[PDB]
Each structure stands twice: as structure tokens, then as C-alpha cells.
Design a protein around this ligand. Structure first.
Ligand SMILES: [Cl-]
Ligand SMILES: [Cl-]
Ligand SMILES: [Cl-]
Ligand SMILES: [Cl-]
Ligand SMILES: [Cl-]
Ligand SMILES: [Cl-]
Lengths: 234, 234, 234, 234, 234, 234
């Protein structure tokens, strides 16, 4: 059994949603899945597997940050995951984005050290699996939920990024910051699995707190519905 | 008038194809465009403008490498370009890719110094405009032309890359090597225009020569046709 | 209230132990603390506050990786933490360090991106607060528990480091690898608080699994006792 | 036959001038050579070969940027080029440099990604062949043409360099900015050939337009004269 | 016999003090040691061996800069040196440090190229031998001499560092700047010898001259006494 | 009076030879100068001033490494030095270089941290003053001493370079390795003074000892003579 996600190959489905927060993982399992069963809780990395419209789907907590997420993704692939979609939150890099809005990550600027270590410092363009990406975009459109399609930035130091630095990045196409996408995308290609990422804007860089829980939760629900429908398309 | 592409307002259409080879530009204008006109020849950067199915389309030579391509794009934008699609060739980094095959660039690993200079050395994920990327993908399908969707690597030292290095990169998702995409994608976001890139494998890294004129020409013909259809879609 | 550690200053003591695993945090509170109470469980970052020999001591989960630990440490300082000591595990960089052995971290090689982001890429020498370092060392002696004193390396890509690479680093003084120390030390100096780290070897890097429970548990129990005694010293 | 510069050993002399602009390559081949024969026009890399004072001299277009230049230089060496002297223009980084003034490049600051790729990110000091350098310098003095001897900087992002940055570099000895010398010098040492570079200032960084064609044209004339004389002496 | 420090094994004691100034070396030998004997003067790298409380002790000049100190350290280790303690001067990074104040280096920010070359650019945390570091701290306390315990930064360009930069580093824990510690600490681990460093503040970054010779001399005296007592402890 | 080279403006002449070894500075002063006088011995940086063919000439010790040499050069400039020529030794990087062979440095690969700091990490091509370089070359020819003209590499870690790396650098034009040139050349441009460097091969990278005393000694004499003649020319 893997060191951190202490499960067994038969526990994980080929399709997996990857929320960073264990509380959201549980909410997803109980709100959307049939016969959900928790296969892991070691290190608080709550992982669940159930059925969504007749198809097996797992929901695995990644923790915060690319180091934590890389560990989970690497072990997930070992356990049999083949399609992995991150469902997280992000901080808007501009007033253009409003809390609750969705972002289908077209690519992720690698401002983290996990992708850097794997790459031995070489340049790279972290992108999701093209099929998964397309399906996430399609579903978001179909459902009609307010969304954007473009770049996010995966960072390591959450409290280091200033509003001024955020504005600067937005000028280069960055819509928001988050802390996991880049490594997921990289590992997708390295391990030969399909990955994708959709995010719900929970606030704007510089803000001392997150948007109203009402706002946030509706955004999360939309995001998860899009991802669940998308993973069944691939 | 710009320094390198010496044209004036009205010469360049909103939609532009960007072949690196001036020979190809001429062949594209004379083969697909009605009443093509050459607005520039300065520094061999041949630029033509004509009609494709009633819509104005320009074909501008970029030259080889991102420094050259960057100059041409910066000036094209100043002249009125708003949708720029690179139509070029690339070297397969793997063995699964066959010469003549098409590649819709989902992103470009920035291995060039041009993007690095604009970014001041910071990490980045060069990606095309999502709608353009999508339109190219869709069109490739509608025409039924065999294609691949994914990463290419934009490099500076054509003769430095070794088959061994190419193979290593392929294990990271790089489908092939070319020398222009990264800077085009970056500028697209920096200047607020829509960019894209479609390539035609013309060889495998390590080969002393390109592929047979015909096998390669059919690829180039299909690539240009997909790009024309796609630019009219946005 | 902080974004991730949703608590109030009055809930957190000045002396805090920082385990990476929420399971160990819970085990520490129940095993060593008097009247322990869980003040946070948001995101699975279990945090408890109780009493050790009459002195208030908090045990806060950091999660894995410097990005996660940095978030927790930043919010703790905001909550009133003044003395923070990491109590975790590490993989031995050479065949001579046996599982269960304790390591008082004299320093932490910054192989992570979190410190890199905060430092804007500049060189640095992550070190604990001298007095805390000294107390940890002294207590280990007072308790008569076999221990090593030296450098550890804080990494981001757990699964990228090969046993050969680990050993190469051992030649430079690295006793073992972990994923949090560097950021804790840096923030200690940046925020003006006292920090330290003590580790229990859980495996010799390269092992498919961790050491047998009893061997590792005794070491973990010893590490914790040294830490608790040490924070009361400052 | 070279991929880009389609020619064969026999078409190229041992002594070669290297203008970036194909238009200048033609002017030179016609204005100073006797019986000039164009051996290549592929990709607009107009290449000629004739006789200067009874000696065979090739004039080969490199294109703009070290990526393009590196490809042309690498192939010329394969065709048998032994002495390659670049004859280009540059943008003054100083205010004491007037358009038309010549510059015998003593070295080239490598701000380009091409040299960086060949060097694998290692530091270097791009310099011409010592003999060629002295020849150009000596000829310039003999012909009494106003000139400077010093450093230039080879850049990638033409439109990224600001007057402010250019002034800063000037204080470190940089006389002007160009886009090809560094790679040429590096390849000269790598491939064991003699290289050199002389430049005619066409403007000052910040200027939207170049200097009067009249003043500028004379500079090119003098420059070419110096270069031609020099290549024969080695 | 080594290239620079031309002594033979038998001239050098296991315990050694390392002043950068040969003038201080001579002064230390004649002031504190019994029967001082000079074993080397080649290249002005004056080295002496005598007795301190019946224990053999050497005083070896390192010269200024890590390149020079690295050469001397390398050769001393080759000659059998086992405990090496630097006794130098440093420039206060903040106005919090008064001239003549002693600093027990807990670590040293590697802003030098010597450590960079040895580490091939990799990150690192240069730290003293833990036992030596502790002995220095202990002795400072016993002798009753005021002192600070913390980080210093080892730089290469004495005249490049500005007051603003100095105050920026002070925010990250840097107490003062010096020019040899980082390399000593690194070689300490690489060559398996025990190292340490104690410094006397001789000025503030930005000061045209050093502090009062009388105040400085007293600081140097105390420093040397501490080092001597310390090396006898290991 | 400067901090390290404690001299008065009237002590140093406009023309200065910069040996790294103090013993060589003295030999030079006594062997070639009329009425030589030592104006400084502080920190072992022995400096002399005398007359060479009726022209004042100073001989200043720089110590080993760019950090030490930078301090000396910075101070010599502040004292009025106008022409500074380094006269040192170097380690041959290839096999075609015999011991005692002279090298007139055309440029210096900056593998050092001193130049790196002054340049804030930016690329650069350290080169001597054109006229000085020219003079040294011409004089070596005049005196008819066998010489080489080309690149040397200035390094920080004398004992880090291996024969393998040395051979690798030779393929890039690096004739030999030394430890001062790069910083001298950079400061030359920065401070507005004329600098140069001529070297005598004392060994081959990897040799345990230097070349035979007389083989090298003859080279050093020829070297000093070339430098003296050259400085009087500028
Ligand atoms: Cl399944
Ligand atoms: Cl139009
Ligand atoms: Cl408390
Ligand atoms: Cl010929
Ligand atoms: Cl001894
Ligand atoms: Cl004088």
C-alpha cells in the first residue's frame, strides 16, 4: 500500500475528482455519489469512492500545495487512477473576476518548486490533458455557469503574493492564483494519465477573508457538477 | 511605418497566418487567396493580403526563431492584426509521430530567450488563445485530417538538441520541436490578441534532411486549410 | 479569524508543536497534554491546546510541504505563536542513520519553492532560533535519548528524489530529507518568532514503506518529549 | 545539402561576410564583387559568391536573431566557411554614439537564449577570433573611418529593451545592442573557425525610426569595405 | 607540500584559528601562544604553530574572500587540520550592532561564488560544526563577554553591497556581512572537519572607515580568547 | 587612505602591474624597478612604486580570487590608478599549452561570484581595455616571446575544477584557468580605467604540483617584461 494514501488498487476508480480540502471531499461524496465509502483517512487525506450516474468515481483530498498534491497524485496513479480532475478554489488576480465564477485552467504558470524539482529547473508549460480540458469547457458552457477559460498560476507562498504582483501577472494572462495545478498537469504527462483542473474564485489577492460562504458554496457546487459530468465524457 | 515590416494601415487584415518560411507565405497567398497583394518585402519578411471566402486574410513571414517572430508580431499587432495563427513545421521528438502529420499546439515549452527577456526570467506557460486553439482543433476534425493535440517546444539552438534530449522531453509531453510558438503565445496575452499555432511534422530530430516533398506538402496543404477555416471561425 | 486555521488568538498558546500529520497531532494532545481541546479542524489541519506541566502548549497540524506549513505558520504567528517547534519524520540520506533515531535540525537546505518565493530567489541559510536549537539539544541530553545534530534538506518533490541523489547530498552534510523545516526557519526570522525542528527517522530513503510501528513510535514518543521539555525552556 | 541554406561545398568561399538583411546581402554582392552568383534563396536567406580583388568572397544572409544566425553559421561551416565576419547594424546604448559610426566588436554580451542553450546555461565571454578582430580594427584605422572598439550586447527581445536599461548597460561598457554577434563568436570557437563583427549604428534605443538613409547608407558602405579588406588578410 | 600553504604535515596542529589578516595572525601567535614558530609565509599566507595551555594550536592566514579561504582550508585539511575556527571582522547589517561586538555565526548566507561552484549552483545552508558552534557560544558566556548568536552573510563584492541591501538582509536575520564563513562551513562538511566562526564588528555597511581601533582591538582580543578556549573543547 | 591598501594618492602611479602573489610583487620591484619603494604591506597586500625607464610604475599585490582582487582594484582606482595590468599564472585547460607559455587574455569567462554580484547576476563578456590588449599583444611579438591570445576563465574554487570539466571548457575556446581577470576587466569598464591581463602557464588542470621553478620563472620574467613595455605604451 502507498505510504500516504493507504488504500488498495481496488479502492480507487479510474475517474477521480481532486479537491484540496478534505471537508469538500466528504461533501462531494455524500452530495453526489451513490454508495460512497471512505477508503482512506490517513494523514487526513480523506478519499472516497462511489458511483455517479452508474459510473465509478473517487474523490481524493490532495492537501494544500504542489508537494502535497504531487504525493497524492503519484500514489493515485499507482492505485489505478487514469482521469484526475482538480476541483479547487483560487484568488482572483484582477477585479475582472468575481467570487463564485469558474475557471477552466487552460494552463498553469509554474511558480512552485515541485514542478521545478521534477523538471530539474528546466522551462515548461504545464497544461491539462487536451481531451479532459475540452470536456470541462464543454460542460461549463452547456450548464451555463459563469466561467473563464485560461491561465492560472500555481504558487508556493500564499502569503507572499502582493496585489501589485497579482496585477502584473494578470497583464500576462494569469486570471488567478492557486496551489496545485502545475504539478498535476506535469505528472499527467510524465505518468501518462489524463488530468484537468477547474476552479471557483473564492476571493481577490490581498483580501483578508474569502467571499460569503453562500457565494463560495454555490460556486463549488457548480464546479463539481461540471467536473463530474466531464470525467464521464472521457 | 514599423521598422521591419514596412507596411501601412489597411495593408494587414485582422486575421493573419504566420509561416516562418517566406516561400510558404507566397505559396499560401497564391494558392488560397483571391487577388493577393504583397504589402511588404523588406528584410525578406514577405507579407501578402487577399481574400479567402470573401474574408480578408493576411499571410506574413516571421523568419526563423522567436527574436525574429517577436519583431514581426509586435509590428503586425501595431498594424491591426488581431487573430494570428502560426502555420509552420516542427521536428518530431518521438517515434510515434510521422512526417506530414498535423499538430495543434496546446502550449509551448519556452526554451527560448525571447520569452525569457519579456518575462524577466520568470516561469510561464505559453498557451494560445483558447477560442483559436479550439477552432483549429474543431476544423481539423471537420475536415477529417489526422492530427495530434498537445505540447511542442520552442527552442533557440536548432543544432544543439540531440535525439537523446528530444526523447527525454517527449517523456514530459513534448510532441515536437519548433522555433516560434512560445513568443507568439506570450505576446498574444501581453498585447491582448488571439493567437494559435498548427504544425506539420517535417522530420524527426536527428535527421539530416526533411521529408519527401509530397508527404510534407500534403501536410502543409492540410495545415494551411485548417488554419484558414479556423481564423474565419473567430 | 485566519483563512485556513479558523481560530482566535486566545485559542492558541505561545508555545506550539508542529507535526505534519493530523493523526500525530491528535496522538500528541491525548498522550502528552492535560485537558487538551481541539480548536480547529478546518481543512483537516487539526490543532489542539492543552497543558504540559502547567504550561499551555498547542499542537497544530501543518500538512505536508512548505507551502502548506508556511500557510499554517503565518496564521499561527498572527494568532500569537511565539515559539514553534516542528516535530516530524524524515527519510535518512545515508545508510548509517537508522529509523527511530532523533535529529535536532541545526539547519535546513532550502530545496523548496516556498522559501524561494519569499526570498525572491536569493540564497539563504535556513536556521532555527539559536536558543530553541540549544534547548532541543540540551533536553535530548538531559533525557538521555540517542540523537544526531545537523542539517536536513527540505524538498518539494517527494517522489523525485532518488536514493543516489540523497546520498550525494549526504556528502555535503545532509542527514535526512523532510518537507517543512526550511520555511519554518525562514519565517521565524522574517516574523520575529522562535522556531526549531526535531525529527524521527522513519526510513532510509528509497524504501517502499516506513519502518515497523513500535520502532518508529518509540522514536516519535521520544522526539515529542524532547520538544515539550524544550519549549518550556524558552 | 544544408537544410536551411540550400547549397553545396563549392558554392561557398572560405571568406564570408554576414549581413542580417537579405537586401543588404544583394547590394554588397553587386556593389563590391565581380561575377556574383546567387547560390541560395531558400527561406529568403539570399547567399552570393563572387570575387573581391581576385579573391572569392561569399555574402550570406543570416536573418534576424541569434537563432536564425546560428543556423546559418552552423551550415556555412559545414559548407566550408573558414572566416565569417558579420556586417550589421546596431542600436546605440549611449548618447555619444552617432548614427553611421562604426563599431568593431571586441566582444558580445550574451543576453540571447541561443548561446545560453549551447552553453547549457553556463557563463561565457563571446569574443571574435583574435586575428580577425585586429584586422578589422587595423583596416578601420587605415581607412580613417570614424569608429569605436568595444562591447556590444546581443539581445533577443528587440521591443523589450528600454532606454533606461540601455543606459544602465552602457555604464558597464556596452556600446550598442544588436542581435547576432554572441552566437557567431561562440560558434567560432566551438567549430574552430575565425569570426568577427563590425557594426554601423543605425539609431539609438528608444527611437521609433532609424537614422536618415543617407547617413546610414554611408556607414554600411564603410563597414563593408573594412570587412572585405579584413577577410582577405586572414 | 601544498601549492600555496607550503608546510609539511607536522607543522600544523589539529586545532587552528583562521584570521583573514596575516597581521592578526602574527599578533595572535605572539600574544597568546608559547613558543610560536612560523611554518609558512609563502604568498603572505603566514601560518604559525605554538602552545595554548599546553595544547598545540596553529594560526593560519586565509587572505580575503572565499576563493582564498577555500584554498587555505583545503590545504590545511590535507595537512591534518581537524578543528578550524575563523576569527575575523564583519560589517554590521543594522544599527543594532555596536562596533567591537562579538558574533557567533550560527550559519552563513552563501552570497559567494566559491560555494556555488562547489555545489554546482544547488541550494545550501552553510553551518558550523555543531560542537564547535556550541563551544564558542559556551566560552563567550563563561568569559563573560557580551555577544550575539545568529546569521552572517558571506559576500564576494565588498564594494557592491549598499546600506539598503544591508537593511533588507537584516530583515531576514542577517546580523552582518563578512567574506569567508560560507565556504569554510561547506568545506567543513565536505572534508569532514569541525569548523566555526566568530566575528568582531568593525563597521557598518556604508561606513568609509572602520570603528575606533581601541574598541576594535578589544573586540578582536575577546574574540581570539573565545576561539582558543573553544577549540580546546573539541 | 583606503581600508585594505593603506596608501596615499601620491604613493601609486598611473601605471600598475597586478601580480597575485606578494613574493612576485617584490621580485618584480627589485628586478625591474629603479629606486623601488614599498608603500603598503597591510594585510600582506605588498605594494611598490618605482621607475621603469624613467616612468613611474607601481606593483600591487591583489591576493588570490576576484573578491580579493576587486577590493585592491577598487582601492587602486580611488587612488588614481589609470592603467592596470595583471601579471599572474594560470592552469592550462588543454594539452597544447606548455608550462611557461604566455597567454594574452582577450577575455575572461566569468565563473566567479564577484563579477556576478556587481552585475546582479546578468550575463556579461569581461574584456580588457582595447588599447591595453593591443599593446600587450604587440609587445609580446616585439620581444619575440612565444605566446597565445585568447580566452581564460576566472574561477572561485581552485580545487573544484576537474580535468574533465577543463577539457570541456577548452572546446569552447578556454585556454586556461585563473582567478582574477574577469573582475579586473569588469571594474575596468565600470570605473573607466584601462585594464589588461597576461598570464604564464604554471601547470595543467589536475597536476599535484606546479611546473619546474625555472621553467615557470623564465615565463614570469618574459611576462613582466611584456607588461612593463605595454603599460608605457598606453
Ligand atoms: Cl473505474
Ligand atoms: Cl480585416
Ligand atoms: Cl501561553
Ligand atoms: Cl575560397
Ligand atoms: Cl595537534
Ligand atoms: Cl604616474
Amino acid at each position: 500500500s502507498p505510504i500516504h494514501v493507504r488504500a488498495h488498487p481496488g479502492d480507487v476508480a479510474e475517474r477521480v475528482l481532486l479537491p484540496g480540502d478534505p471537508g469538500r471531499a466528504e461533501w462531494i461524496a455524500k452530495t453526489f455519489l451513490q454508495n460512497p465509502r471512505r477508503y482512506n483517512d490517513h494523514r487526513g487525506l480523506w478519499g472516497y469512492t462511489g458511483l455517479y450516474k452508474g459510473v465509478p468515481v473517487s474523490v481524493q483530498t490532495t492537501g494544500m500545495g504542489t508537494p502535497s498534491a504531487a504525493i497524492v497524485v503519484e500514489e493515485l496513479v499507482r492505485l489505478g487512477a487514469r482521469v484526475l480532475v482538480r476541483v479547487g478554489t483560487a484568488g482572483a488576480a484582477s477585479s475582472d473576476l468575481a467570487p463564485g465564477e469558474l475557471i477552466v485552467a487552460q494552463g498553469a504558470v509554474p511558480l512552485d518548486g515541485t514542478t521545478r524539482q521534477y523538471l530539474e529547473g528546466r522551462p515548461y508549460a504545464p497544461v491539462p490533458d487536451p481531451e479532459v480540458f475540452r470536456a470541462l469547457w464543454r460542460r461549463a458552457e452547456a450548464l451555463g455557469y459563469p466561467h473563464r477559460v485560461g491561465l492560472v498560476a500555481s504558487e508556493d507562498a500564499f502569503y507572499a503574493t502582493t496585489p501589485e504582483e497579482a496585477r502584473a501577472w494578470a497583464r500576462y494572462g494569469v486570471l488567478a492564483f492557486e496551489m496545485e495545478a502545475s504539478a498535476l498537469f506535469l505528472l499527467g504527462r510524465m505518468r501518462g494519465v489524463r488530468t484537468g483542473a477547474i476552479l471557483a474564485v473564492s476571493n481577490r489577492i490581498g483580501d483578508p477573508e474569502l467571499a460569503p460562504p453562500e457565494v463560495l458554496q454555490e460556486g463549488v457546487r457548480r464546479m463539481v457538477e461540471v467536473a463530474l459530468e466531464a470525467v464521464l465524457e472521457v
